[PDB]
Amino acid sequence: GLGGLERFCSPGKGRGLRALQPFQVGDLLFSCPAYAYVLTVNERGNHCEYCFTRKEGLSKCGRCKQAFYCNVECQKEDWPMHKLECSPMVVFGENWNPSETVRLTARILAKQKIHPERTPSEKLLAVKEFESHLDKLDNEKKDLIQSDIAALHHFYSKHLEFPDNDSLVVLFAQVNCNGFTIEDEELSHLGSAIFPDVALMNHSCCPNVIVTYKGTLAEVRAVQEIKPGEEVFTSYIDLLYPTEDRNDRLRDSYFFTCECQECTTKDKDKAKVEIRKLSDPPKAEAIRDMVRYARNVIEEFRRAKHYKSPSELLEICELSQEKMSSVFEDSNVYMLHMMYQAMGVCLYMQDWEGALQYGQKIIKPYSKHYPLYSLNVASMWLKLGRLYMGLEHKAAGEKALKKAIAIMEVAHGKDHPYISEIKQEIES
Ligand SMILES: Cc1cc2c(ncn2C2(C)CN(C(=O)c3ccn(CC4CCN([C@H]5C=CCCCC5)CC4)c3)C2)c(N)n1
Ligand SMILES: [Zn+2]
Ligand SMILES: [Zn+2]
Ligand SMILES: [Zn+2]
């Protein structure tokens, strides 16, 4: 189905989505209800488990007191999926630690037993039809799937009937590369879901669509004019980084290399890796070393985001920046990576001033490096606005919040609950 769209074979790629009618900028292509979903553990007090709405003072689950809901209606409708974790959270207590993947694969198995037939989440692609890339996964990723399986058994023993090891390996591999992360208006991680039809769409570093969420509902809107017969492209990755960096990430998770206009021309590559205009210009050899150092420290930081302290993480950001500053211009995407990373640590530690100072340095190069309609730009203006408003800068506040609404009206749509919320912030 899906009015004015069709599944097809995209040459040189595979299964894709194609427009059959035109779509102007801001037009809703389709909506895909969540086949399976979960709210992340760290967002448990702030958000409803069933619809993901952000509210303070949510009703608690009487049994576990770990799940929070808008009303009894969200609580009752959530129970089929919550019963998988409700009694095991009480039994295991603070030891209850299944990974978000294990948590999601559990809901998938539950949806397979209650609704074995094609769901409205599966109008053009089925979960069972998902790519698993099992032939391509290393020993590390296969060991984590074995680990995931043991965790599923250890934490969901009492509420599920499990298929054999081989069936569960395929499913865990499938979820790993097909699972969607859901973010809020600020790009903060909210949870994980299965959107079978959204997963049909192929990748481009110049996308003509963006995926946003209305609670657990995924929404696909046009960010470029789409003509009948043109293929529908979303971006699988973060479009801030140069071509090699994007293709390295693409190969890592989806084992394919990109061939779009941006990957071909590499026009934004020189500007993304901006170099200081020194009287003695740094040598190509020195430019090479700083790019490697940066890519190395980016990996070092992600790993450190597990064991090192927020004040330790900041030292890495600050010293990495200071080191890179020898060759890299402040608009360089590697500098910007660490500025963003320290902003997140500042927002974490509630250093609203430190965060605001990062954002201010981040936003002009962001609108220069990302496309016009980009969730990273809108969420950065939204974060700047909210911080400005919090620190008594109303003129700079309304200015940044309006700039967020501008992009967001096109991505999230003019009637989105987010736009209203932000408007209430300017008005009241
Ligand atoms: C050569 C080529 C092939 C291309 C392609 N474009 C898509 N192809 C495929 C046919 C190959 N595919 C896969 O290997 C492949 C595996 C799982 N999937 C589906 C995934 C669903 C989840 N999203 C993520 C997106 C955003 C952030 C949150 C995390 C979730 C990522 C996608 C695609 C699709 C392109 N430009 N070139
Ligand atoms: Zn609710
Ligand atoms: Zn409960
Ligand atoms: Zn590309």
Structural commentary:
It comes from Homo sapiens (Human). One of its GO terms (molecular function) is histone H3 methyltransferase activity. Keywords: Chromatin regulator, Cytoplasm, Metal-binding, Methyltransferase, Nucleus, Phosphoprotein, S-adenosyl-L-methionine, Transcription, Transcription regulation, Transferase, Zinc, Zinc-finger. It is a single chain. Helix 9 runs antiparallel to helix 10 (310-324). The longest helix has 21 residues, at 284-304. The protein starts with a strand and ends with a helix. It has 3 domains: 5-42 and 180-237, SET domain (Beta-clip-like, Beta Complex); 43-178, no CATH class; 238-428, Serine Threonine Protein Phosphatase 5, Tetratricopeptide repeat. It is an alpha+beta fold. Helix content is 47%, strand content 12%. It is globular and about 70 Å long. It has helices at residues 72-82, 86-92, 100-114, 139-156, 165-178, 243-254, 261-265, 269-272, 284-304, 310-324, 333-349, 352-369, 375-390, 394-411, 417-427; strands at residues 5-10, 14-19, 28-32, 36-39, 59-60, 68-69, 180-183, 189-194, 202-203, 209-214, 217-222, 231-234. The chain contains 15 helices and 12 strands. A 4-stranded mixed β-sheet has the order 1-2-12-9, with no helix packed on it. The structure holds the ligand Cc1cc2c(ncn2C2(C)CN(C(=O)c3ccn(CC4CCN([C@H]5C=CCCCC5)CC4)c3)C2)c(N)n1 and zinc ion (3 copies). Residues 12-14, 131, 177-178, 180-181, 199, 202-203, 236, 254-256, 258 line the site of the ligand Cc1cc2c(ncn2C2(C)CN(C(=O)c3ccn(CC4CCN([C@H]5C=CCCCC5)CC4)c3)C2)c(N)n1.
